Amino acid sequence: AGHHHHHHEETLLNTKLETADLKWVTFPQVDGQWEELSGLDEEQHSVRTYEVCDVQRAPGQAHWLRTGWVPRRGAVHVYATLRFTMLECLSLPRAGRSCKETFTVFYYESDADTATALTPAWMENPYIKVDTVAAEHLTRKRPGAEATGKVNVKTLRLGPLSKAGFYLAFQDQGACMALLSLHLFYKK
């Protein structure tokens, strides 16, 4: 009945507990790229968010977003909890053939923070595929007027990790999604 498991969690990165710009790296740097701005979440507190919604405009294009360099500290396996909203494609006006209700996640380790805006190759290898992430819940909106929806929560797993640090990237291929927050941590 009263058996206990204590397992302490150490945060690698938490966007919710930041009150300044996140300044993450995007590629290619074109109108339609992911974009940083403030918003509210289901807790109703103002946080740093990332949005992409280039659903008819995209022609075979990948919008990548990549975090800053994250010290692994002592983590071998990292957890990455994402909170997001994803729009239903057949409910968006001007949504094309390109429209996805999913997105993909990757990581890259390196011994130092030596990633740039154009290096390394923005493509799987040297990037390591974590998962393609689909939405259990879709949001429907009418511009200026009204919205229905629920926030998606997904925790992905990643590793084993070896090097001093890593970066986490998001690849969009046609979704209309807000990344409300990302929490990377490990359990000691």
Partner: protein
Amino acid sequence: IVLEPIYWNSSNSKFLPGQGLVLYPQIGDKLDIICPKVDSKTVQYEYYKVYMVDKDQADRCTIKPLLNCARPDQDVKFTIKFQEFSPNLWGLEFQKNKDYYIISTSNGSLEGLDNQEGGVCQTRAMKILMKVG
């Protein structure tokens, strides 16, 4: 187009008698509203809860919040992107050739931080009006 940050403290003289602050941001624009830190050259932090309100709720000075400025040791910020559609369920969404407003009914002190009526807004003209497009 990143417009000039707006510092939300009573030393800000851009909040003019009666009128308050008036901006004209275009769609695509971004604007930081900053509640500033009490640093090593400033005595007397100013406690505000800052809100986006409708014309009638701005006219005059009631609520029913984009910044919770109750943190002296930290620069607290909201950045608005003036866009017509957000994929955030709670995202801010704005019309070409329409006006939006931002007020605070807090009276600068901890006690009144949560004052649902008064301000700032109706005492010191502490508000913005954004004539978008």
